[PDB]
Structure formats: C-alpha cells, structure tokens
Amino acid sequence: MLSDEQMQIINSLVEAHHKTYDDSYSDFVRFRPPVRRLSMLPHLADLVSYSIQKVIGFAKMIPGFRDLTAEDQIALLKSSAIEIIMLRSNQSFSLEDMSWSCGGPDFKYCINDVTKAGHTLELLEPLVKFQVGLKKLKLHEEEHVLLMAICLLSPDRPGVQDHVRIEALQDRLCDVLQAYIRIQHPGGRLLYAKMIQKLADLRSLNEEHSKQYRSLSFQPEHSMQLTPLVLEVFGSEV
Amino acid sequence: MLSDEQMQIINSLVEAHHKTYDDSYSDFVRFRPPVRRLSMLPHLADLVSYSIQKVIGFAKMIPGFRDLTAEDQIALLKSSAIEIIMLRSNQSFSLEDMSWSCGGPDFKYCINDVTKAGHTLELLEPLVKFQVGLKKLKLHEEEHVLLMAICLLSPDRPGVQDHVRIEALQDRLCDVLQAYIRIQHPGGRLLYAKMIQKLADLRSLNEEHSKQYRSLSFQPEHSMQLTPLVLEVFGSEV
C-alpha cells in the first residue's frame, strides 16, 4: 500500500504538472512564427524559453524544493532544465508522426525543423530515440510526473550545496515511484529500471545539447535570437 | 551649387537608407504577434530590436563612421539609437491616422498600443507631437536621410573619445543639409532651423524614454520580454 504522505506527494506532483502544462498549446500562437539558415531558431528558442518558465512553476510546487536555498534552486534548474523539457516534450511527441504535435501543422515539429534551429543530428539522433523509447514505455501520468521531479532533485548536479537535503527529497520520491509501479502499474516489474535508465539517457542528451549550445551562443548573430531567460538558464553563470 | 563630394554624400546617405528601410514592412510578419498587462511589449520590443539592426546598417554606410574606432561607434549607437528610431518611424507615421501604419491593421500602432508596451503618456505625448511636427515639415528624402546621419554623428554624446573627428563629420553633413535646403528646397529659408530644433526635441524624448526604460528593465518579469540586442544597446554598459 501507498502511504498517506506518498499519495499526497503523487496528488501534489500531478497538480503541479496540470498547472504548468497546457494540452491546448494555445500560448504557442504568441511565439515568433516558425519558418520552413536557422529559420526555426526563433520560434524554437521561444518554445524553449516558454518551457523553462513552465519547468520553474513545476519545481516550485514540488514538496520541499520551495524550502531549498535559492542558490540550490538555481543550480538545480540550471543543470536540469533541458532534461525536464526533453522529458515533458514526450507528452506532445507522437510515435506515429515521429514528431511533436503541438496543435496544428504549424506546431508539428518534425526532425527537419529541429536541424533548422542550429542543432545537428548528433543531438537529434539520440533525442528521437529517447522520445520513442520513453513513449513506448506507456508511462502512467503518475510516473511521468514523478520521473520529472526525480530528474530535477538530483544532488549530483554541478554546484549544489546541501546534497543531503535534496537527496532526502529525491529518495522519498524514488520510494513513491517504486511503490507506485508495484502496487499500481500492472506489468512493471521491469519498469522502474527502465525509467531510471532514461535518467542516465538524459544526462547524455544534456551533454550533447549543452555542447551544441556553446556552438550557437558563441556566435553573436545566433545568440541574438535567443531570449533573456534562455541565455540566463543555459548560461555558464554561478 | 552643391559640390561634387557633398552630392556623393547625399547619394550615399540615401542609398544607406534605401538598403535599411523596407517600405513593404514584410519582415514584420516574423515578430511576436501584437495583442490588443503589456500585451504589446513583445511585438514592440521586437520592432525596436529590428530597428536597432537597421540603424546599425545605416550608420556603417555613413561616410567615415566606418572609420571611427569601435568604441566610438558603440557609444554613438548606444546614445543615439532611440532618437534615430523615433526619427525613422516618421516614415510610417500618418497625420491622418495619428498612428504609424506599417502594412495592414495588424501593424497599425495607434496611441493605445504603445501605452500597452510599458510606456506612459509622459513619453507618448511629446513623441506624437514630434512625429506630426516632423511630418508636417514635409521633408525631402535627402533631408530626412541627412538629418538622421546628423543626429547619429553628434560628439556631445556620453563617452565619445575623438570629439574632433566626429564633429568634423557632422559639420560636413550640416554643410550639406544647409546647402541642400537653400539650392534645392523651394521655401526652406526657415527649414534648417526647424530641423535643428527637432534634434533638440529628440534629446528630450530620449531622456523620457531612457528613464521609462529603467522602469521596465528593473522589473525582471518585463525585461524578460526584451531581446538580447535591446538589452545590450539600451543597457547602461561602457
């Protein structure tokens, strides 16, 4: 049985996701329009910036992340944001389309659109495989949500200070994820290992993205298209 | 008579304007769409950033501004950019509409749209009067162009280093503007003083804008909507 606190942790983490995820994608109509050189970098940088904002609102509703010192909350978001975006993007991603489908065809980002935002296939190959490998895992929303809060609260991120407190949080979440898949996911004796594997998958997608981010940001004619928030979160600040 | 060099200075300054001014306003369809809180700050900040880019391309084609040290070229653009935008915006402005008309009604910025980008009527009152006072001056394109290069090359701008060289440029331009209105503008015995008055008008519109800019930029929830280039040019850097 799931305890009373671990069930509130589930209810509260799902609430957080439902507040910061818009299944209508209606706020997309206010990004810089896409183009299909880097015709897609402005609309896509807007999408990343939009996402970063939603990731911060998720994190602030995670139990006890609000309680962590502001330095810790920055360092966690600074190093985990791109993983949590890649993680949340699965919701729009479609196995059939092999593309994130965010409304109409104007927000159907296939693989070509992404190469036209400065990113090479060395990031795009592992990312599409991540998306379908996570998709095919047919996760319950209570596991997708939980996995996100777990990737966030990792102490093994550069420049965190109270390892023992954010580890105390993440473990408590890992406990909730494992008991959920046992008690609640019919067939998931293998699943919690599958999910924890996606976490290691992420960190390697993070490495490639943040390496290809340096390529774009060292070109001022490209960094010109980014947004104040992107430049702040993916910047190398301390 | 206009000399051979002063006529090339006119031909070259007009060329510069014709390269950096798009009378179709077609690149507007790629700004963040307008909304009519600050519903207009994203589209309008995009317009200002777009403009700053066109102002830099104008300046680089002004004779001998290219020759000035990069520090001087930065300091001139840093303090003159908003005046040269306000100056160039007259081209789209309409006495009849009392609004800049940049294509369809989607790019018809009346006075309400501008208050919805963070700016108060203390900037909007003097600016609309500037626009119609400059408009009614029915300037020749060779004077509108010349006045822009003159407002740029002012040595009395904060942090310029070679006053005597950029003064040498601006005078040479003032000489060309005066001889143009005498030899070429039928009725402009009063006009060169009218134009030089708009310059003093500008500096006072500059003061109000850059004061109201500090209000917006000290609010990170608003500065979030600006662009890397805006923040760089209107920033207080040295």
Binding site: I56, K78 | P220
Partner: peptide, 10 residues
C-alpha cells in the same frame, strides 16, 4: 546574479 530566475522563483 540570475535576475529573472530569482524573480520567477519569488
């Protein structure tokens, strides 16, 4: 510091 991050986090 991280102005916008500080702001968004309250």
């Amino acid at each position: 510091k991280h102005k916008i991050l500080h702001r968004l986090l309250q």
